[PDB]
Each structure stands twice: as structure tokens, then as C-alpha cells.
Homo-oligomer: A and B are copies of this chain.
Amino acid sequence: HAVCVRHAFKQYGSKKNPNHVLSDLNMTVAKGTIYGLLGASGCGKTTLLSCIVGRRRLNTGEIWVLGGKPGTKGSGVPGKRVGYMPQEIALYGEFSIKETMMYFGWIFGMESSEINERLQFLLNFLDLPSQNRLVKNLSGGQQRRVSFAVALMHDPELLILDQPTVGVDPLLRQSIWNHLVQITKDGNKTVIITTHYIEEARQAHTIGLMRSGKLLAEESPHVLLSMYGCQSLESWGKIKALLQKNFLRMWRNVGVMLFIFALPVMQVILFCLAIGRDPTGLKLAIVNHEKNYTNQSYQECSFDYGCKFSYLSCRYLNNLRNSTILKEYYPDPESAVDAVKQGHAWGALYFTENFTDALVARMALGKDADPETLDQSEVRVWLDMSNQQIGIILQRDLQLSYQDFAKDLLGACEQNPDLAEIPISFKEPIYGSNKPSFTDFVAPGVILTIVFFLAVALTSSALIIERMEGLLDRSWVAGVTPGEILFSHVVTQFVVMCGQTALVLIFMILVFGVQCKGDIGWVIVLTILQGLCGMCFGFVISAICELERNAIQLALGSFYPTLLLSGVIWPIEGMPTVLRYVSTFLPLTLATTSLRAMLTRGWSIAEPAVYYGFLATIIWIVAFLTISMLVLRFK
């Protein structure tokens, strides 16, 4: 009694329109007999073979195969002792015969020195081309022989062959049907072959027949006659097996695999060469009314150097920045405000005709300057602050350049160069530098973000291409637990993840100068943990989504929200009291802050603000793994 099902009850669809594919289905498969499951096109026949191998639940029925119900420790359906073959060719297209016969080879614990030994016999028995040819150029008839040979070499004790001779010449059909008889002679195997060639199935021993959702009769072919008609017929092996297949997948498309190693370097060079550097090509409209106006980009600047004050208007000029500001001269203030208005400059200074006289009478006299006097020593400037980032550095430079001009007047002729100072003294910063830049605040948040997104793109179509290329539903029967496909995907992608994580760190620290006052060793550990969380975030997306087009847009749709909720281009303190609290329990918000306290401040792991990032990035790794595992086990 290899297979025996009692009172099967299955149906498709809703209760309003039931299908009722199977009603009773009482059958018995003996040991050592070629069970032929003949029938009619339309009844439930494949749904019974797929229920024997435990691919579909029997819907409140009694089943018993090789000892017990499929998928139970008391049975043997999932394992090396049960053969299988799908109705359609479930074969990987990028694997050659010598590789597709070895991927299924040592899943069943088969030695590598015997798979090759028996491959020659299997290739000589049924005609096939050289073993080096990939199984995608094979014809429609040679793609069925490979499938027949793949799930027959391991010598099981039960065969679930269905339609194994569709698309072959009659001689090859006889040769195939002459093989199942020979291996079954000495009571060592059972065959459940079902075929649509009713005449060809006369060699069976327990020919079956189905009429309406149940077996009609199960007798010998020579006994079925004279009663109904007159004449004729009316572990370590599994892990290694699917680890050389993931590695082989990347090697098949060399040129694209090398592209992923040229993305982090290109994504980093652009960032370091664009963000942070100040503008150096902004012009100005100077209309100083104390010297003759000749030409346009030219004006005299021969002022006086010493105690005697003269031409002070062209002493503030040439004292401002000589590189970031370009000087162009206009004769009339009503023309300077015109040029900037039509986008020909970024501002317009204006020095009154009596500027030196008005300025020398404002410093000599203290707290006794009349309103008229303190109205012509002013430097009127109209700023085109429509950029909110260039006008900020323009108004931050004009007044800052006046400090040097003020010190030059005082520190060279009259007194010490310290009177012209605001009482607010900023001393020396404890941790940072007195000249902050936008390229130092954002770089901590970019290195942890580039790695996170690259890992997401890597493991985004990993769990979704298993059904794309087949070789999955027929591999579940082979004993591959769902927890091993996910585990091996982590190992193969983590190896290549570290190949680009180091490139990000090397090109951001060695080639481009970024301060690393803290421990360099712990920076590497935190970065690869974030990348591991990133690749774990791509598995839940792949597991939840089913369609190929349904998963690309979901990870792609998460680009901006994690770039704003995390603190990258703006401090986390600017958000309201509710959004900020919610935006703390996220993978990236508590990691950039921890990394920002290690690159600049120089703290160690023992500080409370540093190890929180490690604690908050490990929990999400576990949470992104159990959720993905639960979904895979669910279906």
C-alpha cells in the first residue's frame, strides 16, 4: 500500500457556484504495480496527483501515502524517496544539462562522483545532445527528456509521472514506456503514470479510470476487457545545491554585475564635487560715485594707504572677497537696479558722492552724529534674494567684509584692532569648528543612506524570480524547506554587499577628506549593519508582492519618505512634537544620529547616544526577518 486515499472531498470556487472536482475518490495503489490513471479531459485528475504529493490541501479528506499524510514526519512525500514530474516543463532555462542534473543531484544527498557516473548512462539511454548545451536551445521534445531524466536518476520508490511522453516520436515513446516496466520487475518501485495514449497504456497492471469525480474501476487491462468492452481500449546538501545556482546567476550576466560595482563610486564622486562648495561665479553692480566712469568692467581704484583717509569707498572694495564676487560698474543707481532686475547681476551697491567725508565724520564723532550725516555714509545695497541660498551668502559676506575694513581703519592708524567688536565673544567650540559647512553635516547621513538603498535594489527581485523561472513547485517536493531559500539568499547577497560597502567608505574617507575623529573600526560595523537591514527590507517587499510590476514601485516609492523622516538635510528637531516622536523608531533616524556622534564628536560605543543606533538597527533586522519568514511559510 504505497498510496491509499479514502473519502477525498475537494471543490473549487465559492459556495454559490461550486465545482465539485472530486466526490469520493476511493483508490488503492499496491507496491510493485504500474498504476495507470486513465480518464477523460475535464475531470479532476491532475488535481489528484498534485494532492498526493502534498501540493494542495485535500479539504477535509483522509490521505495516506508511503506511511502517512504528506508533510508529516510519519510519511515520506517530501524527501528523496518520492519521484515527481510536472505536467509542464518546470526547468530552468539558463542551466545546462550537466548543471540542471547536478542542482537536483546533491539535493537528495547524492555524491558528486556518482551523479556524473550515471549521467552518461541516462544520456546514452535516451538520446540527447552534448551535456554542455544549456536547456533553452533544446527543442520541444528534447526539453521533456531532460525533465524525465532529472527526477528519475536518484532511484526513488514512488513515481508520480504525469504525461511523460507528450511531444516525442513513437519510437522514443515505446523506449520510455519500455523502461518503467523493467525497473518495476523486481518489486522495487511503483509508477502512477497517467497518459492520454490509451492504447499505449496496455502494459500497466492496475489500470484506473475516472468518470465523475471518483474512480469508476481499477482492474487489470486484461480483466477490464470482457466486462465493459470487447477489444482494444474502449541540511548541508540542500544549502550547497542552491548556493552555486545563485552565484552562477550573477556570472551569466557579467557586465551588469560590474555595473553595480561602478555605481557607489559614481554616486559618491558626484556628491563630493557638488554639495558643499560655495558659489564662485556671482557678480555685482558697483556704482561708486567718486571716480570717473570709463568703460564697463573697469574703474580706477588708486586709494590711499596710511593714516590719511581718502577714497574710503574704494577701500571697502578690494577688501571684500577677491574670488567669489565679480565687479561690474554702472554710472547711475537707477541703472544698477535695472540690470539686477533683468537677471544681469545679483545685487547693486551704491556709494554716495560724499562718502569719505560722511564716513570720516561718523567715526571721529561718537554719539553726536546728526541724522543728515548718518544718512550719506551708508552703503545702499539692493539684493536679488530670489535664490535663498546665494543671497544668504551675499549678505553674509558684505557685512563680514566690513569687519576687516573696520579693523584696517582702527588697527593701522589710531588704536588696537579690537574695539570694533561686538561684546558677544564666541570663544572656541568644544566639539565642532568655528567655520561650519554644509558638506560636513550631511555626509554622515548620506553614507548610511547610499548603502541602505543599494542593498534594497539588490534584494528586491530575489524572492520574486523563483516562480518566474520555474524549478520551485517541483523543488518543494524535493525537501527544500522555505526557510532555506531565504537563508541562502542572505548569504549570497551579503558577500557582494560588502564589496560595494567598502568602496563607499574608501572613496569617502581616503580619496575625499572626511574627518574620522572617532574610532574607525566601529564605523565599518555600523555601516554593514545598516546595509544588512536594507537587504532585509527588500525581502519583505518581495515576499508581500506577487507580480513583478507590483514590487518595483513599492521600494521605489520609499525613496523620498525615508529621506525626509530621517535627519539628512535638516535637523530632526525641526519637526513638530508628534511627528518627531513617531520618526524616532525608524531604521535610519537613530543610526545617523549615532554616526554623527562618532565621526565628528569622537565618542565611543559606551556612550548612551552611540549604542542606541546599534540597538535600534538590530531589532529592525530581526523584525524584517520574522515577517518575511512568516509570509513565505504562509504561502
Contacts and interface: CB of A to CB of B under 8 A. Distances in A.
A495 interface: no
Given A140-B87, A424-B398, A385 B432 contact: yes
B574 A382 contact: no
A532 to B, nearest CB: 18
Nearest to A538: B552
A16 interface: no
Name which of A263, A385, A423 has the most chain B CB atoms within 10 A of its CB. Answer: A423
Interface stretch (A71-79, A162-170, A475-483): A162-170
A88 B140 contact: yes
A506 interface: no
Contact of A555 (B172, B276, B556, B579): B556
Contact of A384 (B282, B431, B573): B431
Contact of A556 (B167, B168, B171, B559): B559
Interface in A182-212: 196, 198
Interface string A239-254: 0000000000000010
A474 B381 CA distance: 72
A362 B367 CA distance: 13
A56 interface: no
A137 interface: yes
Given A388-B438, A560-B450, A575 B274 contact: yes
Interface string A269-290: 0110111111111100000000
A26 B400 CA distance: 92
Given A42-B139, A275-B564, A552-B556, A423 B385 contact: no
A429 B385 CA distance: 6
A18 to B, nearest CB: 13
A527 to B, nearest CB: 16
A198 B293 CA distance: 104
A635 interface: no
B140 A573 contact: no
A231 interface: no
A389 B439 CA distance: 11
A457 B416 contact: no
A384 B571 contact: no
Nearest to A468: B548
A421 to B, nearest CB: 9
Contacts of A341: 430-431
Contact of A42 (B142, B387, B461): B142
Contacts of A266: 561
A42 B556 contact: no
Interface in A256-276: 256, 259-260, 263, 266-267, 270-271, 273-276
Contacts of A596: 386-387
Contacts of A12: 137
Contact of A383 (B40, B390, B429): B429
B573 A281 contact: yes
Nearest to A551: B552
A531 to B, nearest CB: 15
Given A41-B139, A425-B378, A556 B434 contact: no
Contact of A430 (B384, B468, B553, B555): B384
B424 A384 contact: no
A386 B425 contact: no
Size category of the binding interface on chain A: 35 or more
Interface stretch (A103-111, A116-124, A369-377, A620-628): A369-377
Contacts of A274: 564-565, 570, 574-575, 579, 583
B424 A383 contact: no
A380 B429 CA distance: 11
Contacts of A271: 560, 564
A60 interface: no
Given A422-B402, A574-B275, A386 B167 contact: no
B561 A436 contact: no
Interface in A446-468: 450, 453-454, 456-458, 460-461, 465, 468
Name which of A380, A392, A573 has the most chain B CB atoms within 10 A of its CB. Answer: A573
A294 interface: no
A179 interface: no
A11 interface: no
Interface string A388-430: 1111100100110010000000000001101100111111111
Nearest to A233: B170
Given A276-B570, A427-B382, A571-B390, A550 B253 contact: yes
Nearest to A416: B371
A553 B458 contact: yes
Interface string A534-574: 00000000000001111111111101110011000111011
Interface of A: 12, 40-42, 46, 87-88, 127, 137, 139-142, 163, 166-172, 196, 198, 234, 253, 256, 259-260, 263, 266-267, 270-271, 273-282, 337, 340-341, 343, 359, 362, 366-367, 369, 371, 374, 377-392, 395, 398-399, 402, 415-416, 418-419, 422-434, 436-438, 440-441, 450, 453-454, 456-458, 460-461, 465, 468, 547-557, 559-561, 564-565, 569-571, 573-576, 579, 583, 596-597, 600-601, 609
Given A170-B198, A362-B423, 17 more contacts: A40-B169, A41-B141, A141-B196, A169-B196, A256-B553, A260-B557, A263-B557, A279-B574, A381-B424, A381-B425, A384-B429, A384-B431, A386-B429, A386-B600, A389-B441, A456-B556, A461-B552
13 contacts: A271-B564, A274-B570, A279-B573, A366-B366, A366-B367, A367-B419, A374-B418, A379-B424, A389-B441, A438-B570, A456-B556, A559-B559, A569-B569
